[PDB]
């Protein structure tokens, strides 16, 4: 095996319309989708790795007035650097304290790495609850 998430690829997909509470959705259900306006910025661009793509997602969140609207100024400083923002304390797991980007269909089962329609934003807690039920 060689890891697909560590090889370059091209972002595709549409994402979904989201609202003000978008990150609140990350702790529920299957997490939040990639926002359509972020997919619109990243679609067709090449990324060096999934971690590079992840930094681009948060950089785009920082640049979108609506999607960053209910981040506080310290959270804004973080996303402006491409860091994932901290979740509320009650959604953290150990040293996993920030929102996570996960693949809905696992890469090993045919899911694409940079397909924005196959990516979900979850809190560490919600990801772990979903994983433990598999």
């Amino acid at each position: 095996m060689e890891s697909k998430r560590n090889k370059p690829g091209k972002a595709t997909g549409k994402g979904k319309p989201v609202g003000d509470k978008w990150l609140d959705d990350a702790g529920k259900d299957s997490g939040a989708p990639i926002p359509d306006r972020i997919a619109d910025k990243l679609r067709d661009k090449e990324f060096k790795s999934f971690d590079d793509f992840r930094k681009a997602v948060w950089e785009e969140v920082s640049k979108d007035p609506e999607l960053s609207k209910n981040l506080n100024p310290s959270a804004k400083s973080s996303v402006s650097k491409g860091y994932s923002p901290f979740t509320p304390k009650n959604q953290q797991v150990g040293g996993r304290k920030v929102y996570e980007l996960h693949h809905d269909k696992p890469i090993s089962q045919g899911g694409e790495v940079y397909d924005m329609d196959n990516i979900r934003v979850t809190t560490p807690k919600r990801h772990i609850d979903i994983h433990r039920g598999k």
Binding site: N72, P73, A75, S77, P88, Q92, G95
Partner: protein, 80 residues
């Protein structure tokens, strides 16, 4: 522990975190974790990122919230 920091040193640490003045996300997470461990405050990182309505979430605001909480709860304060 927090009593190894002067208030000035602690204000520098909080300002680093609030500005995200770090080399990587990993470094920022390590710093926030250390901040939580020093303050011992039940709200953890929420002091910085999810402040209670009416709390001053500037760096000096967070330092003062920590200082007052520790005082109210019979805990040690800053060096000096």
């Amino acid at each position: 522990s927090i009593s190894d920091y002067t208030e000035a040193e602690f204000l520098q640490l909080v300002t680093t975190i609030c500005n995200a003045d770090t080399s990587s996300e990993e470094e920022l997470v390590k710093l926030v974790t250390h901040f939580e461990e020093m303050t011992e405050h039940p709200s953890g990182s929420d002091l910085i990122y999810y402040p209670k309505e009416g709390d001053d979430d500037s760096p000096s605001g967070i330092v003062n919230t920590v200082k007052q909480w520790r005082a109210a709860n019979g805990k040690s304060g800053f060096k000096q």
